[PDB]
Symmetry: C2
Subunit: 89 residues, 2 copies
């Protein structure tokens, strides 16, 4: 298993009302920037992932433009949403 424990914690269960910082790759700095843009719960970011039809390029660019995430952060956040979706959607 190459993923972080944080990714595994997130994909193991429905997300409910978890904050955005529960997503892999979303540390406190990115999380604050997301929350002040309205993306305060993990499910709101999931929403954007889904409206972008799960496209990696579009979603990772969106995250970069919205909170300044770097390549590793956006990869981790995308992969964590992708696997959550495969498990629960």
């Amino acid at each position: 298993m190459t993923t972080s424990q944080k990714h595994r914690d997130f994909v193991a269960e429905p997300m409910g009302e978890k904050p955005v910082g529960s997503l892999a790759g979303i540390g406190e700095v990115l999380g604050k920037k997301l929350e002040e843009r309205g993306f305060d719960k993990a499910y709101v970011v999931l929403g954007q992932f889904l409206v972008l039809k799960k496209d990696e390029d579009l979603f990772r660019e969106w995250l970069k433009d919205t909170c300044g995430a770097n390549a590793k952060q956006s990869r981790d956040c995308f992969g964590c949403l992708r696997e959550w979706c495969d498990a629960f959607l």
Copy 2:
């Protein structure tokens, strides 16, 4: 009161179900939703979630996007709300 279409949708994960599986989304609305890129049910779920599950704003967005009437938008919102309570 609800339709069997609603209950069937809220009973299980939606996976790749087409947009026409949503309660309220008939053949006419579905086509218009597909034309605008909302071809699968989960894309409409996505919009519901980006709008933080706000009933008024989601139902208005649906009217603006595919022309849904009050009952169609009621039915569609309600089935996404109950699906989310079960699975999200």
